[PDB]
């Protein structure tokens, strides 16, 4: 059990234990009387004359992991009679070494609004202990982010791999105008971090946030019916790096899409617009590499079409017909003529006024009618009408907007009670 | 009815009526034989000698509203024997006149962000018909506002009085930079607007909206512990007119209020601030006329106190004591020293790091302890401790922030296994 013949053997011993202790008692048989220890003794392992193998110094896995020893039996004369046989000492590991970061100071940089979770810098540390045991198994962690807005982490670190990346929130909020420069303190721990007794090292990471010039531009307003020569530049986008191939992606599949994009990222309008066909547009600008692989998120472009006065007022019909009783007196409501304008509601482009131009016949007098200037309502201006005297009136009404006029024809039929 | 003794009476007749019938037959007993009509006859009202009172053409309430007539009975000689008595003709009104605006074009202006509902311009119209009847009772109304942003009315009009003012939304969103200049078309209707037969007039109203320079300034950042001469200008407010009386109002009603305002509207900090007693301030700037009237709403002032590193790290107590057993081996965790810094959390001002300076005694050797640079945790660095070789260690730990260093003292008592 702690004694026995010379045969191949392996013992496993913890390093860093008190330089006492026996390993094993080897047993003789005549003609053999003494024993000899050779190999990687490293002035640590010793055999007594009569078979007692032991070590006299602390072992160290880090200086040497396995000791390859040989034990021979000698006869009384001093000649080898058994062996040598190999005795193997496996030095079992303890956590006697602190992890060390390969640099005390790190620098990285990351583009604003880059994919969260993507490595931009690695911090690497090592531990001289056994990677196949807690003792040499490392766990990284952010100690502080400086500066820090409202307890919100803009960076994170992969607890195993040492990869530093932006969080969701960093991708989104990190702005080099507000804050171009961040310090991270990183801690590494052995024992996979899972012990209060683990050994720790720290290091410093300076991070520069580089500019992103790929952003959604300001909403565009374009006047319809452009009298100017086309195409016209209306907005632009720029990829961070040169060489990109620019597309425009039209989200509805419109009949004519009157915007396109050139190779510098300039967005042009091809044609005149018409408010009256098409009020507004949304589409996307996309950046490509030489390979046809999208470079980033697409960009939302908005075009508002401003109205011009490019439709005149129209008549509700070739002749609009109203009937009035003779028993009706000064100020009767007769009817409302409502002309239409295709230009933009509630603007001066579509805001009609009304004037009576002609009245035939003028009997018994002219001016028997008024039309309310904006409501378009016809009232009797003077007296009652008399079917006996004239059965019917024909009015020419001038409907006009800001800079167009239109003539519309109204018939007033006189009826009895 | 239609006949009776000569007595005071009152009849009511529509204007614009061509007469078809007499008004009344007055009867008198002998000695009375004929009758006489006097007063406001306007060569319209007539009495026949035989007592027959009537009118001879259309009346007009606008030319005359009440006719005050007298009828007397006469004798064969021509002497009065009854009366004269008052006969009253009330001319009942009809809606034969359009309302008219006194001007076809109106011009006004209003200061941006002024009191909504407050008249700045009056449009007046008149109607010759009877105020006491729908026929001469006027109703104003906006036809259109040009331009109009997102179907939102920036102006309104008092339907009776003709007063034009800003709506709530005009007060708030009207921006003279984007758009200083608005047209209103205003309609007036008789019949109190309630009839589709009413008569209408319209007018044009041109409005310029003047700029408001009375606005809340951008929030201020002021460093604490200013070494500069006080008071220090930090922001400003301006009323639209000169002669405003600028004041400051502290809501928190603090013991020490370290801001002031001068008569130009300039806002000062009066003293050094200290983040560590007081982090931020809010107060209000107020404008008054020379009698004490809030020239307008108060203005909200925000002062953020920026931190400087002006407190050094502190010790959790003069001596911090931990106990270690002899059976504790390399790397066993002993204890955590947590120093304090009053400066701003989660900044470099308060971010402590730890170094062991001294270990006494150095027996059996120096360097038996390490401290985790930021966690402040003491671990055994080399070997076990032995009460035989000293019952106690004394460590001097240098706690330092960005600019200051402080020595804190840790005592390790070596004790027996249990
Ligand atoms: C760019 O602006 C042009 C205006 O300079 C736009 O042309 C207008 O197009 C509308 C719709 O097609 C036409 O409206 C028609 O109006 C006629 C009566 O028009 C009469 O009025 C004008 C006097 O202003 C006179 O020039 C003519 O002799 C006509 O007698 C109605 O019968 C129809 O129902 C219809 O409403 C306009 O007439 C036309 N104006 C002109 C000057 O050509 C053009 O569409 C704009 N383009 C875009 C694409 O936005
Ligand atoms: C403006 O800045 C001033 C200086 O930066 C601030 O003065 C500080 O006031 C605090 C407490 O009110 C003091 O902190 C005390 O520190 C001692 C230990 O002090 C030793 O170390 C300091 C710094 O190196 C050294 O100067 C001394 O000689 C000492 O040997 C503790 O025992 C206290 O509890 C407390 O922490 C600072 O001592 C003092 N610093 C200085 C450099 O004068 C001032 O209060 C600031 N005012 C505002 C309005 O912000
Ligand atoms: C009112 O307008 C109508 C429509 O044009 C007139 O009637 C036309 O009169 C012409 C000759 O003047 C005839 O040849 C047509 O047969 C009529 N058209 C129709 C369909 O009735 C009418 O004359 C006008 N009346 C007045 C009093 O102006
Ligand atoms: C770090 O560096 C060492 C070489 O000295 C290498 O063997 C190791 O694989 C590297 N680790 C990481 C996490 O990239
Ligand atoms: C380390 O990272 C993985 C996620 O990648 C996570 O599941 C695990 O919980 C983390 N370890 C600790 C101790 O947080
Ligand atoms: C006009 O305003 C009065 C109060 O001034 C209000 O009571 C009345 O309802 C309004 N009339 C209409 C038609 O809204
Ligand atoms: Ca070792
Ligand atoms: Ca280790
Ligand atoms: Ca080891
Ligand atoms: Ca058009
Ligand atoms: Ca139009
Ligand atoms: Ca148009
Ligand atoms: Ca009249
Ligand atoms: Ca009247
Ligand atoms: Ca009237
Ligand atoms: Ca302070
Ligand atoms: Ca401070
Ligand atoms: Ca500090």
Numbering used by the authors:
A (entry chain A): 26 to 442
B (entry chain B): 26 to 443
What is the paper's account of this structure, in its own sentences?
Liver intestine (LI)-cadherin is a member of the cadherin superfamily, which encompasses a group of Ca2+-dependent cell-adhesion proteins. Human liver intestine–cadherin (LI-cadherin) is a nonclassical cadherin composed of an ectodomain consisting of seven extracellular cadherin (EC) repeats, a single transmembrane domain, and a short cytoplasmic domain. Previous studies have reported that LI-cadherin works as a calcium ion–dependent cell adhesion molecule as other cadherins do.
The crystal structure revealed a dimerization architecture different from that of any other cadherin reported so far. A previous study had suggested that LI-cadherin lacks a calcium-binding motif between EC2 and EC3 (9), and our crystal structure has confirmed that hypothesis experimentally. We also observed four N-glycans and two N-glycans bound to chains A and B, respectively, as predicted from the amino acid sequence. Indeed, our crystal structure indicates that the few N-glycans present in LI-cadherin are directed toward the opposite side of the homodimer interface, suggesting that the protein chains belonging to the homodimer do not participate in cis-interactions. The interaction was largely mediated by EC2 of one chain of LI-cadherin and EC4 of the other chain, engaging in hydrogen bonds and nonpolar contacts. Although Phe224 does not engage in specific interactions (such as H-bonds) with the partner molecule of LI-cadherin in the crystal structure, it buries a significant surface (71.8 Å2), that is, 95% of its total accessible surface, upon dimerization as determined by the PISA server.
